[PDB]
């Protein structure tokens, strides 16, 4: 029933769905607030109290599919997180270049959220998009170098990483799982 390319791993659009199902800070451009003198929102998979209390030009916290849906309307503009600034990305780049053995303390959804906000929020960034995408590509490349260095330690027992992103888990999942499964199969056949 399940397709062969969705058998033992997630597709990247399922990762997009998973990271669309998080809260995010946002600026409404419409007023749905009841004054002292309109059907309610009434959702069942997220808290609708922050969406019922939606005030124009304020900071609220809504789920990301609502964020993208309202950005398509341009009724509400998505605010980038703290780590999507040039200074914080430069700090992450310096941490990557400082400790070669350890990955930086980036969020798990740092590639997928960046792609979503680049392709959907082209006028919602205080810093320019240009150097932001340059630093995103630099962090992606240095994380690729670190996972290429760490792949020399493919052990039969176990293998650990600290702060690898979910999209990088789907980058490296079938290769690592198949190679370690066959290494374990070789050693378990080697046991008496």
């Amino acid at each position: 029933s399940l397709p062969a390319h969705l058998q033992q791993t997630f597709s990247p659009e399922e990762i997009q769905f998973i990271v669309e199902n998080e809260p995010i800070k946002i600026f409404p451009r419409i007023t749905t607030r009841q004054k002292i003198r309109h059907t309610r929102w009434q959702l069942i998979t997220t808290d609708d109290k922050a969406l019922n209390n939606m005030v124009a030009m304020r900071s609220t916290e809504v789920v990301l599919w609502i964020a993208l849906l309202l950005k398509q309307q341009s009724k509400c503009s998505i605010v980038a997180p703290q780590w999507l600034t040039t200074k914080e990305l430069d700090r992450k780049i310096q941490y990557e270049k400082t400790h070669p053995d350890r990955f930086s303390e980036l969020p798990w959804n740092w590639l997928v959220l960046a792609r979503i906000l680049f392709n959907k929020a082209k006028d919602d960034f205080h810093d320019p998009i240009h150097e932001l995408r340059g630093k995103i590509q630099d962090l992606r490349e240095i994380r690729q170098i670190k996972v290429l260095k760490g792949l020399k330690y493919l052990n039969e027992s176990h293998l650990q990483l600290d702060n690898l992103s979910l999209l990088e888990i789907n980058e490296l999942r079938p290769f690592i799982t198949e190679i370690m499964d066959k290494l374990r199969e070789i050693h378990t056949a080697s046991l008496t």
Partner: protein, 197 residues
């Protein structure tokens, strides 16, 4: 040895797996190899004759102290290898027929056998029985892609007349554009009469 014909059958089993791996859209299946399985059935009939002959020779009991075990095991492994080849090819065709039923018919009769035709038909009745009763609000044969875009632009490929939807009536004039929800026309995208994003 004797089971090399089954190995030849399993070669086209590997060939149709490599056909399925490179064809993302469900192509027509290769024709059912009737002649090779007829040869394997003649082989297993000859193996039945051989094991009955060695049973009656063990009843006669000439030169059958320790030898008859050895060709008993050789004939048993030959039938086991033939069963392995036949069941591997049959289960590969079974799995690709299950995928074909789940993909397109849920949401070309020359190549299948009559037993494969009734397998596909009764599996179609099973998968249309699954979405009835319980699990009815969802569709089990529906799209496995997430609905990350609630509204899409849709272009009409072929002229399919006037159709209905949930609360409105759609047209299928050839080469026209709709700005409609993905779930309203998702089945029609699966039929291929509509195709965009």
């Amino acid at each position: 040895m004797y089971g090399d014909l089954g190995n030849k059958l399993v070669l086209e089993a590997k060939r149709t797996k490599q056909l399925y791996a490179r064809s993302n859209q469900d192509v027509n299946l290769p024709m059912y190899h009737e002649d090779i399985i007829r040869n394997i059935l003649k082989e297993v009939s000859n193996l039945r004759k051989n094991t009955e002959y060695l049973k009656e020779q063990q009843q006669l009991g000439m030169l059958d102290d320790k030898v008859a075990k050895c060709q008993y095991f050789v004939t048993l492994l030959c039938m086991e290898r033939n069963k392995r080849c036949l069941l591997a090819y049959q289960r590969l065709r079974t799995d690709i027929l299950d995928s074909m039923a789940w993909n397109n018919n849920g949401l070309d009769t020359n190549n299948l056998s009559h037993q494969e035709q009734e397998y596909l038909k009764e599996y179609c009745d099973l998968i249309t029985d699954l979405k009835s009763g319980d699990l009815v609000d969802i569709d089990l044969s529906g799209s496995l892609v997430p609905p990350s875009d609630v509204f899409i632009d849709v272009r009409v490929l072929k002229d399919a007349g006037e159709i209905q939807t949930e609360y409105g009536v759609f047209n299928l004039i050839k080469d026209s554009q709709f700005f409609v929800r993905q779930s309203d026309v998702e089945r029609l995208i699966q039929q291929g009469y509509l195709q965009k994003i």
